[PDB]
Amino acid sequence: HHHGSHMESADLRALAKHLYDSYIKSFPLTKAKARAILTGKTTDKSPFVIYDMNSLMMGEDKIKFKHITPLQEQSKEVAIRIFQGCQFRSVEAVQEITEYAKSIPGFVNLDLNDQVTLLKYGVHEIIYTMLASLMNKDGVLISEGQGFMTREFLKSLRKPFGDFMEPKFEFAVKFNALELDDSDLAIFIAVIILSGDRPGLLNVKPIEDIQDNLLQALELQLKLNHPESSQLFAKLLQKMTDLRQIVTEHVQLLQVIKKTETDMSLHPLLQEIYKDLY
Numbered sequence: 583h584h585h586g587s588h589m590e591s592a593d594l595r596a597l598a599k600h601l602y603d604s605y606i607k608s609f610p611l612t613k614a615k616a617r618a619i620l621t622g623k624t625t626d627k628s629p630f631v632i633y634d635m636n637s638l639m640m641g642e643d644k645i646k647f648k649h650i651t652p653l654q655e656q657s658k659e660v661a662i663r664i665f666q667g668c669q670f671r672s673v674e675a676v677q678e679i680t681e682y683a684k685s686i687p688g689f690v691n692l693d694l695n696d697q698v699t700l701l702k703y704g705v706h707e708i709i710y711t712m713l714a715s716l717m718n719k720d721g722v723l724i725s726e727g728q729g730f731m732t733r734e735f736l737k738s739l740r741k742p743f744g745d746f747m748e749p750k751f752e753f754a755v756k757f758n759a760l761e762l763d764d765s766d767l768a769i770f771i772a773v774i775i776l777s778g779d780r781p782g783l784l785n786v787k788p789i790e791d792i793q794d795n796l797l798q799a800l801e802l803q804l805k806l807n808h809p810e811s812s813q814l815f816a817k818l819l820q821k822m823t824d825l826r827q828i829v830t831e832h833v834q835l836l837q838v839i840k841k842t843e844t845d846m847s848l849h850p851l852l853q854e855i856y857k858d859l860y
């Protein structure tokens with residue numbers, strides 16, 4: 583309706599500053615930095631770009647690990663290698679999202695199982711959201727922004743994998759047009775985590791009490807940060823529901839990979855070895 587300046591908004595603004603500070607510490611590559619890389623507006627070096635098989639073969643030579651596994655199915659060798667690469671990064675994203683989730687005021691004091699339930703269902707939606715920060719119309723920044731894989735190259739992968747990243751790109755172009763910065767995304771991520779309608783929650787009301795404060799802080803943030811924007815808060819609420827129906831089709835997609843590959847779930851001990859050596 584109208585804005586007041588009455589210590590209540592001062593608390594909502596302080597919560598946004600607190601969420602932004604934790605957001606910066608939890609995630610190294612911010613959207614503000616990712617946008618600087620995508621437009622060259624950075625004194626740092628340009629990332630390596632993978633746009634075909636030659637540039638991918640040239641990019642594989644820059645990695646210390648080898649992983650030959652010589653076989654006849656080289657089209658699946660490349661597709662599996664790329665899929666296992668982003669799979670590994672997803673694990674690193676979870677512990678970063680969990681780190682940020684701990685910093686949301688009140689999250690740690692919740693039931694320990696509900697913290698797992700909120701993260702179990704919310705991690706996929708946050709990765710879906712933060713993936714848009716690394717994308718433009720051409721491709722996506724990968725590996726701490728040191729690599730850039732084009733959208734059409736990912737599109738050309740073998741039958742099941744050529745459609746894995748496409749729904750994410752189609753979401754990113756619609757989501758990036760909202761022009762949210764890191765300050766907006768910090769509260770938007772916190773609202774996604776504290777969703778009281780996750781299946782199997784125990785104490786729903788304490789979760790909604792936290793989210794209502796985050797929803798108020800977000801609305802105050804969007805109206806201040808985006809003066810030339812109309813109904814941006816309602817647009818973000820719809821984008822959350824868009825994630826739910828599109829992330830279930832995402833988990834149904836990779837469950838096919840979990841079965842039609844007959845050996846895709848990376849062994850937990852071997853995956854831990856790659857983590858501890860790097």
Ligand SMILES: Cc1c(C)n(Cc2cccc(OC(C)(C)C(=O)O)c2)c2ccc(C(=O)N[C@@H](C)c3ccc(C(C)(C)C)cc3)cc12
Nearest residue numbers: 630641642644647648649651662663664666667725728729
């Ligand atoms: C060496 C290697 C290993 C061991 N894995 C894990 C792994 C793969 C495949 C199956 C797998 O699981 C089973 C089947 C069990 C197994 O065989 O071990 C496990 C990789 C994943 C991706 C890439 C890569 O090259 N990724 C591309 C996208 C890129 C990204 C970034 C760059 C920079 C350096 C330019 C930033 C270059 C190239 C290389 C590797």
Ligand SMILES: Cc1c(C)n(Cc2cccc(OC(C)(C)C(=O)O)c2)c2ccc(C(=O)N[C@@H](C)c3ccc(C(C)(C)C)cc3)cc12
Nearest residue numbers: 645647667668670671672675709712713722723724725856
């Ligand atoms: C295809 C792809 C995407 C879309 N991404 C970004 C990404 C994915 C998942 C969540 C995620 O989340 C957010 C929050 C958006 C974020 O991180 O920004 C961001 C990648 C990152 C790295 C690699 C890779 O292939 N990297 C090579 C260099 C490697 C990896 C691992 C190995 C081991 C297994 C041998 C250790 C070797 C080589 C591939 C991808």
